[PDB]
């Protein structure tokens, strides 16, 4: 932020103030989602449909 | 010790602007919004119905 400043050699007004910025730190970090479909080969074969790609 | 603005002032000049000078407003209606008639004369006389049977 800014300020006035006056004018003076002398006076506290005249002084130009000082200041500061900052930074800060976010994340992301990856977790596993996961599942096993086990089947029997039998099953598999005898039906009528594609079981694997279901 | 500095030269300050006081030290210098019988060198620093103000300016001057008209943005805020303005002359008045003619705000007056009555003779542009009613029936004027030119009188001819200081007095006009006009007759109106009073009563009637």
């Known amino acids: ?54 | 010790a500095d030269t300050n603005r006081t030290d210098a002032a019988a060198l620093i000049q103000e300016a001057y602007s008209d943005v805020f000078l303005d002359s008045v407003s003619e705000t007056a209606k009555v003779i542009g919004t009613f029936p004027v008639y030119n009188m001819g004369t200081k007095t006009t006389n006009l007759p109106v119905l009073s009563t009637f049977p």
């Open chain 1, 1 to 54: 932020h800014a300020k006035w400043v006056g004018e003076s050699a002398t006076a506290p007004e005249g002084v130009k103030p000082t200041a500061k910025a900052t930074w800060a730190n976010k994340t992301l970090v990856a977790e596993e989602l996961a599942v096993i479909l086990p089947i029997h080969e039998n099953v598999l074969a005898d039906a009528t449909e594609d079981l694997l790609a279901e």
